């Protein structure tokens, strides 16, 4: 089968947006008056760092980002030259809701708004190359029920 070229060293960048402190959200957004900080999230950032460095990616961590700050970070990588890279990874660790993720300030960022910044037209140097996004967040407040098997 055809396989994506994956031999560059580093393979490419692995962004890690790690949101822990939601004090701004609790104070600014009424319905988020009781949203709690994401204790333990650093364990995820550390695991991702170790895992992808082992896989030859260059890790770029960013902690506690508001929505505006997230878009700024993505713009920087959208405009960056990935010509010598074979892949691009972006990991988002935060709170979320249906189809969105929350910035530390409680503002919403549509998932599509995040991934669309790296399409072939917007980031030509990544055209034809795999763009991987891992999103760790709720996508609603419903508990997924179980079924016996």
């Amino acid at each position: 089968d055809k396989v994506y070229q994956m031999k560059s060293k580093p393979r490419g960048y692995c962004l890690i947006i790690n949101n822990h402190n939601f004090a701004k959200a609790r104070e600014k957004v009424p319905k988020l008056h009781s949203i709690r900080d994401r204790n333990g999230t650093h364990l995820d950032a550390g695991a991702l760092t170790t895992t992808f460095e082992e896989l030859h990616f260059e890790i770029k961590p960013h902690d506690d980002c508001t929505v505006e700050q997230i878009y700024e970070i993505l713009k920087i990588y959208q405009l960056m030259d990935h010509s010598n890279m074979d892949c691009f990874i972006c990991c988002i660790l935060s709170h979320g809701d249906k189809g969105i993720i929350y910035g530390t300030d409680g503002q919403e960022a549509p998932i599509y708004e995040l991934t669309s910044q790296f399409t072939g037209l917007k980031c030509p140097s990544l055209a034809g190359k795999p763009k991987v996004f891992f999103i760790q967040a709720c996508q609603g407040d419903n508990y997924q029920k179980g079924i016996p098997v």
């Binding site: 089968d1 333990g40 249906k98 795999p130 179980g146």
Partner: protein
């Protein structure tokens, strides 16, 4: 030259299907990310592709549960990848 879709070659790994919660153990990390890294570390050296690895993550996370609410978690990948995706260790 040749042309492909503007939105080709994307892989989106969601910790959960829409409308539902995803879990985080303050002393261990989240169900999804911890499972993802464990699977990547164990399977990439074997040459398994990402779709196969994410399928295993779906299996592993599907076996975990939140007693307090009898809750479960179902990860969900979406992709426009046009080729097999592997992360060689060499």
């Amino acid at each position: 030259t040749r042309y492909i879709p503007d939105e080709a070659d994307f892989l989106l790994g969601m910790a959960t299907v829409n409308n539902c919660v995803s879990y985080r153990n303050p002393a261990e990390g989240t169900w999804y990310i911890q499972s993802l890294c464990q699977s990547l570390r164990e399977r990439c050296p074997r040459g398994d592709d990402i779709l196969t690895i994410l399928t295993e993550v779906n299996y592993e996370v599907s076996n975990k549960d939140d007693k307090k609410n009898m809750g479960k978690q179902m990860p969900q990948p979406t992709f426009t990848l046009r080729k097999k995706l592997v992360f060689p260790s060499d």
